[PDB]
Amino acid sequence: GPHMATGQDRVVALVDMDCFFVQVEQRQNPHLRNKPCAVVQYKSWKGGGIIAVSYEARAFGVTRSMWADDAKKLCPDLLLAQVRESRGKANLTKYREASVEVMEIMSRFAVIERASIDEAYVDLTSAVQERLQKLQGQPISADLLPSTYIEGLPQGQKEGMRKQGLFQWLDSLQIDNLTSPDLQLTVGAVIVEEMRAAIERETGFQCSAGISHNKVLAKLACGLNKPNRQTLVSHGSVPQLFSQMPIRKIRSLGGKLGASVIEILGIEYMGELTQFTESQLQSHFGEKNGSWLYAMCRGIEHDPVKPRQLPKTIGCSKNFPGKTALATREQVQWWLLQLAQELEERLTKDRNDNDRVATQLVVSIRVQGDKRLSSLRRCCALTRYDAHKMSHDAFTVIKNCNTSGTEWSPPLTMLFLCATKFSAS
DNA sequence: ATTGTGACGCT
DNA sequence: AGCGTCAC
Numbered sequence: 001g002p003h004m005a006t007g008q009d010r011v012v013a014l015v016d017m018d019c020f021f022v023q024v025e026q027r028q029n030p031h032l033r034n035k036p037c038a039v040v041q042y043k044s045w046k047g048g049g050i051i052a053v054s055y056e057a058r059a060f061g062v063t064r065s066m067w068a069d070d071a072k073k074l075c076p077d078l079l080l081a082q083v084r085e086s087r088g089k090a091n092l093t094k095y096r097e098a099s100v101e102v103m104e105i106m107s108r109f110a111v112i113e114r115a116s117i118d119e120a121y122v123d124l125t126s127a128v129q130e131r132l133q134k135l136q137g138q139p140i141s142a143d144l145l146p147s148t149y150i151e152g153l154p155q156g157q158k159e160g161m162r163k164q165g166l167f168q169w170l171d172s173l174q175i176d177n178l179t180s181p182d183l184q185l186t187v188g189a190v191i192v193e194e195m196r197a198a199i200e201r202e203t204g205f206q207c208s209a210g211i212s213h214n215k216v217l218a219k220l221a222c223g224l225n226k227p228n229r230q231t232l233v234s235h236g237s238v239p240q241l242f243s244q245m246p247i248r249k250i251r252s253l254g255g256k257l258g259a260s261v262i263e264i265l266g267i268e269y270m271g272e273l274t275q276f277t278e279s280q281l282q283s284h285f286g287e288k289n290g291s292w293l294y295a296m297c298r299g300i301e302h303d304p305v306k307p308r309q310l311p312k313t314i315g316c317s318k319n320f321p322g323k324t325a326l327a328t329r330e331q332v333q334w335w336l337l338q339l340a341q342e343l344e345e346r347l348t349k350d351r352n353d354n355d356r357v358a359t360q361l362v363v364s365i366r367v368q369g370d371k372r373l374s375s376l377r378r379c380c381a382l383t384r385y386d387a388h389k390m391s392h393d394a395f396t397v398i399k400n401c402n403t404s405g406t407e408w409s410p411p412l413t414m415l416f417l418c419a420t421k422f423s424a425s
Numbered sequence: 426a427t428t429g430t431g432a433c434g435c436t
Numbered sequence: 437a438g439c440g441t442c443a444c
């Protein structure tokens with residue numbers, strides 16, 4: 001009753017760019033704007049692999065991981081932008097820099113946790129407190145929430161329904177209680193409208209957002225009304241939302257763990273999890289996972305918004321599928337040097353921008369016929385940003401996998417170099 | 426012949 | 437440290 005914490009202490013937002021790589025290319029090339037278009041990597045094998053898809057193209061069924069020739073079968077007028085190639089591999093620099101633009105804007109409002117190249121979590125608790133004290137008791141107008149949906153409303157034209165649900169929400173707000181969680185979420189949604197307006201004005205990129213009490217609910221909310229809209233998921237809306245929500249839709253339950261939850265417990269939806277005790281869930285899935293599941297099916301999650309805007313690792317990877325697998329010493333050396341050269345460029349830029357230096361170099365390889373995505377992962381010291389030294393060290397670390405008696409056997413299907421363990425510089 | 430990343434957990 | 441899981 002009174003002593004049961006409800007997970008309503010924080011206001012957390014998740015902001016995620018709409019078809020991000022496509023928007024980057026459309027800003028650069030106006031001919032692609034408001035068109036079915038996609039961003040692809042490489043071009044020889046089946047027109048290239050698709051990695052981003054505009055919503056106009058999604059209406060025809062084009063998806064990520066689709067080959068471009070098959071997408072053209074679905075959408076003959078599909079326009080394509082190619083990822084930059086450098087040193088024989090895809091180079092994502094343009095998208096990382098656009099990401100930095102977005103992150104730097106978001107950092108002006110509150111402390112963000114970079115969750116991916118195109119999304120970040122925001123802890124807005126202090127911001128909502130300050131804004132509530134500054135309001136001094138005046139109500140919140142629907143004009144301050146022009147693109148916000150309230151999940152589970154209305155109850156009892158899409159824009160008409162959105163406005164109806166918003167009016168229902170706002171008419172029920174207790175604006176004199178500065179401690180009301182629903183009011184806090186609402187003021188958070190106002191701040192998030194402002195953040196998304198600033199992002200669009202200063203970059204041209206549109207984004208969606210979720211506003212709730214934790215990271216999981218914020219991300220789930222963000223996905224509900226994409227694109228170019230934001231969604232507030234309140235504590236009280238959790239029972240209904242979760243009553244038909246497949247378990248796999250919740251962050252971290254999309255893989256084998258969610259499948260085991262479904263199979264062992266004989267359930268399909270998130271809300272059904274409430275029928276089990278914490279001890280039962282711990283017995284089936286471990287203490288940490290069990291506590292997490294017991295709280296999460298009730299809308300409660302405590303994972304903090306970490307103050308980390310920069311990545312922790314800088315990596316360079318290339319696959320060599322099929323008959324292109326590396327089978328000679330010279331091939332492995334040359335590709336290790338290409339990877340190390342891109343890595344050195346990015347590492348020097350990172351040192352100059354962020355006042356830090358990586359100290360450990362991770363080398364990973366996949367070998368042909370091996371079932372696992374990574375066949376070997378070994379680390380060595382990273383003492384200077386030199387591509388020749390880094391590639392030589394990677395070769396020294398991996399050379400005992402060659403079972404040949406000039407040749408390389410069995411052939412390598414993936415190379416991977418990663419700089420980690422940063423220290424202030 | 427989804428590719429190229431990046432974070433975090435387990436032992 | 438090296439391997440595995442998960443998303444993005």
Ligand SMILES: Nc1ncnc2c1ncn2[C@H]1C[C@H](O)[C@@H](COP(=O)(O)NP(=O)(O)OP(=O)(O)O)O1
Pocket residue numbers: 016017018019020021022051052053064117118226227428429444
């Ligand atoms: N599997 C993958 N492989 C390579 N690049 C990928 C990728 N998945 C995503 N990217 C790249 C391309 C993506 O543009 C970008 C952000 O990933 P999302 O947010 O998951 N997808 P998007 O922003 O496109 O659309 P929306 O959020 O509106 O549904 O990262």
Ligand SMILES: [Mn+2]
Pocket residue numbers: 016017018019020118
């Ligand atoms: Mn996105």
Ligand SMILES: [Mn+2]
Pocket residue numbers: 016017116118119444
């Ligand atoms: Mn994303």
